Amino acid sequence: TTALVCDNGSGLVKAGFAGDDAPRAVFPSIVGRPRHQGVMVGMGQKDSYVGDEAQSKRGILTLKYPIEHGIITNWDDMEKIWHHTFYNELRVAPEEHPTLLTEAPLNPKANREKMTQIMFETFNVPAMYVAIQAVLSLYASGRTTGIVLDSGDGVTHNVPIYEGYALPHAIMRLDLAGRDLTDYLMKILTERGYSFVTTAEREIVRDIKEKLCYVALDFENEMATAASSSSLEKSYELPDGQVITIGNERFRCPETLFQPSFIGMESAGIHETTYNSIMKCDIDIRKDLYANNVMSGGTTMYPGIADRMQKEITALAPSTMKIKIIAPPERKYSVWIGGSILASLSTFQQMWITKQEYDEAGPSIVH
Amino acid sequence: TTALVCDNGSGLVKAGFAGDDAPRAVFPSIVGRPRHQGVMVGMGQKDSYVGDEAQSKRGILTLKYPIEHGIITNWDDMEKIWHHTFYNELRVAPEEHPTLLTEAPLNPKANREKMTQIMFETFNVPAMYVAIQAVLSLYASGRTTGIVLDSGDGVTHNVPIYEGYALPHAIMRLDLAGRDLTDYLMKILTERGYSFVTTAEREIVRDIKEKLCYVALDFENEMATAASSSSLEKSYELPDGQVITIGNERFRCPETLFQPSFIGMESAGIHETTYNSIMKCDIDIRKDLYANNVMSGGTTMYPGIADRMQKEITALAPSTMKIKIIAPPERKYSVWIGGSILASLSTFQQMWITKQEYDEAGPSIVH
Amino acid sequence: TTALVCDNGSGLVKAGFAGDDAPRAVFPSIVGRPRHQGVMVGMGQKDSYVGDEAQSKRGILTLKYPIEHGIITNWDDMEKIWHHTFYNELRVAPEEHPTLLTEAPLNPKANREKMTQIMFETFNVPAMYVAIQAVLSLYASGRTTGIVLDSGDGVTHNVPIYEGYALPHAIMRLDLAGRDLTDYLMKILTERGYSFVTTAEREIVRDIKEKLCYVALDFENEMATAASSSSLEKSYELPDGQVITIGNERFRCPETLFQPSFIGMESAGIHETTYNSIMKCDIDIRKDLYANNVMSGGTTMYPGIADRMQKEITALAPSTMKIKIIAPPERKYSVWIGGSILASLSTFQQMWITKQEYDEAGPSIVH
Ligand SMILES: Nc1ncnc2c1ncn2[C@@H]1O[C@H](COP(=O)(O)OP(=O)(O)O)[C@@H](O)[C@H]1O
Ligand SMILES: Nc1ncnc2c1ncn2[C@@H]1O[C@H](COP(=O)(O)OP(=O)(O)O)[C@@H](O)[C@H]1O
Ligand SMILES: Nc1ncnc2c1ncn2[C@@H]1O[C@H](COP(=O)(O)OP(=O)(O)O)[C@@H](O)[C@H]1O
Ligand SMILES: [Mg+2]
Ligand SMILES: [Mg+2]
Ligand SMILES: [Mg+2]
């Protein structure tokens, strides 16, 4: 038997057996109950559709993401994600695979207890471990030192690791992006008359967030050049047929990551949380936090980064210091490519939670 | 085969086989425990890093000097200093080499016994001799008479030696230099906002004690030119982005050597310990103590000495007596260049402690 | 006419004329600009609200404390604190009152000069003196000898005074508390799902630092009884209606005072800085510093000290030495009750800085 690396995405849950390429299965985590009367009565209709079927039945359901602010909203829907995934996606037996699960560095307890407990008693996995997503993005990177910027929809993190230790008093969590970037994009699409009201229509917003957004090099000059009559304007096509023309707002929405006041978030931007996390680390270690600034996750893949991120950090940081922004190929699968390396090496198999230990100590005192 | 001269520095431990030019190994003596949580778990991280690597891995460790106020603070770290030095620096086996160790003339007994005993019983050397650090600097100096200064971070001593034997009742111990100069520099750089709070950051202070400091010719008039618009400000560069500009305090810290009331030490300065040790020596011998004054150790290498020390001694000394304060080139290796000359010469090699005599007498009668 | 004692709070600026019972005005020192679009247009909204009214107008502003790590961060807002205090609280003319101002024992210069200079040239005070806060707590103490532990949010100090002299070679400053205690409390309330990321709610964290915290007598046994189902849990009420139930973390947070490791600070605890400052003083003068251990400042108000503080000092100190921990009622006003006694005394009113001296000597020779 082989171990299974399953990343508890907040998107965009990722699943695949131990190594070597990229996750076997990726899906948007949606469950949706039917919001219009069934009186056609074929019948044959499912009580709750999961993805991908919840993306081929839009407008007849009400899509509900089961993870909200990085917290499992109800484990009733979450367990159904898991069951659906193991049985009708991956097609593997629970009692036959040691698993690897992920979490967020700054998150409430007993959220990991209740998780660990429900998966051991419901699915009876033969072994389990729960890793923070940032440490796996360090393993994925393959650098041995650096400050990790792990940004997925929608919990970001700033974790500093230096060969091979970490500082407790340094992690910063912003709930800045990205589901709020979806809502903000929906609020500034009203500026060109596009009103997307329903849950289903929110997916269309997400599709323009995927394909057509970019980030500016300099805010003031992109705002200036938007005022020019020259066509920044991009023509999107709608699944119903319609042609949607977006301009200014196309670079405005991601720019929020360099200015949270515009989305109504008081705290300082990714720009400043990077600097302020570096200046919570000791004198010697700062030298190598500069030039081991490592980004990760799907929401760091916008076209205007990393050279925006580069120019902005390089301006605020102390003069004459070597600053390079490490941005891997295919950051969306970074965490998973991390997890594969971890569970395949010796000896951290003997840092896995196992059934004998669970029988003795249950959800209590896991470390 | 060849005998080994290993000088028990208080700094800055010095090691090299017998003959002729300079020590083969010099290192900051630091042992450092791991102070942060080891979340990477690669791992390969050793239980404790010694120097030199504990000076390239600062902030991930907490440096604890193993010799404190001139006494070995714990032999658990000290034995590891020795073992690390013999095996992974010099690259030799102790059963193959007679060793030569150093001590201080005004230190506790039986801490020289316990040293001698632990190295004979732990490392199994075939022969040993223990010299006080001042006497070896006389052989290095090549003089037949004079007062000897071993001044290191943090115990100095002042020993008068005549032709061909020493004067028992004239030895003076000042605890004034040099770790108290390190700590005083760390307290008076805070007055210009350079608040070096942590243990690790204290090493950076020590590095500014090497390069930037100097000594005055007259305190009152150097204090005058600090008040002047003229630059006494020298700008140092740090491993972090930070350019530090110190002025007055740059010459203020070493001046403590001629005024221990600055560091709140009640003892009289180098000025007075020179004079008062000479005026505890006999009238006839004083004639040849003047103009046979030998400085040694790393903390006598500051720029503004020795003609400050000279001018101060010439002011207190009797009228019409010729006084030249002659201190060698390359003082940092002085003690060691002593030890090489001693252990290579006939005949007192056959007055060394040897394995059978150690078996017979143990730590008893080591004087 | 009458002299005015105005204490330059780290919190918590305190003001009242010479004598008797307590300061007449106490306030949290915050300035806050409005972080929202002002499109209601009443109008009448001030450019920035100072305290205390800015603590009844939270959330519609972004509160910024003017003193950060024991230094005044920008003197424009500091000057506005002063201007607001004299004019819109006290209602006294600066040209009519000789004042008394405070500072921290170990702080960079020209921080007291630049302050003194700005207050003389901007507000045109007729006479002034600047006292360090620990010395003023000596008059409040009512003992003429002893070691002063002055801890306010966030500068602690350890000053030894012996009838009626001060030992300069022994003052210890820990930057251990208290804004970092607020921040640590905000970070360990996330463990029970209570997260308070934005500025206004951070005040509420400070309020829970008052009310529900207590110092443990035995850490290991309080952690044990926390593991038990016994009601260590206290129910707080939150301004929007929420009921917050905190347990463990209530006694964990203040315990940081004896374990700097909790906040990740390298430095030694109050436990050890008390002992290590005493063992930097002269032999005959700590036997009278034991039992004249005098606490001060608002961050020593917690229940659970002083008999924790007592047991901890008594455990590290040598046997057969009498120990007593002097902790006044109302330590929050200690500094001020000091200042009142000072400004009433003859003759050292004529050792205050007068305008004639300032006209002649300016910002030089202040100390
Ligand atoms: N090319 C792209 N440009 C911008 N955003 C993208 C792109 N591709 C995916 N995303 C966003 O990234 C999110 C997925 O991030 P992910 O790395 O899965 O986070 P997590 O792993 O925490 O769930 C999606 O919600 C999507 O909105
Ligand atoms: N150029 C320099 N100027 C001033 N001090 C120095 C210089 N070089 C070394 N030192 C000091 O001298 C010390 C080393 O002295 P050393 O002769 O090794 O004493 P010991 O042999 O007793 O250990 C170091 O702690 C360092 O602070
Ligand atoms: N009952 C209490 N328990 C614990 N902490 C308190 C209590 N009352 C006040 N404090 C803390 O003490 C601080 C005020 O201390 P203070 O003596 O004003 O310091 P300073 O005078 O240096 O400003 C506040 O920041 C508050 O957090
Ligand atoms: Mg994530
Ligand atoms: Mg020495
Ligand atoms: Mg204070």
Numbering used by the authors:
A (entry chain D), B (entry chain B), C (entry chain C): 5 to 371
From the paper:
Myosin motor proteins are responsible for movement and force generation across multiple scales of biology ranging from muscle contraction to cell migration to intracellular transport. Finally, by comparing the conformation of actin in the myosin VI-bound ADP and rigor state structures to bare filaments, we find that actin structural deformations accompany motor conformational changes during the force-generation cycle.
Despite this preservation of filament architecture, the actin protomer adopts a unique conformation in each of the three states, with local deformations occurring at the actomyosin interface mediated by the D loop and, intriguingly, at distal lateral contacts in the interior of the filament mediating the interaction between the two strands of the actin filament. Unexpectedly, myosin VI engagement shifts the H-plug towards the two actins located on the opposite strand, with an increasing deviation of position from the unbound actin state as the motor proceeds from the ADP state (Cα RMSD 0.9 Å) to rigor (Cα RMSD 1.6 Å). As the unbound actin state represents the conformation adopted by F-actin in the absence of exogenous factors, we propose that our free actin model represents a low-energy conformation of the H-plug and D loop in the context of the filament.
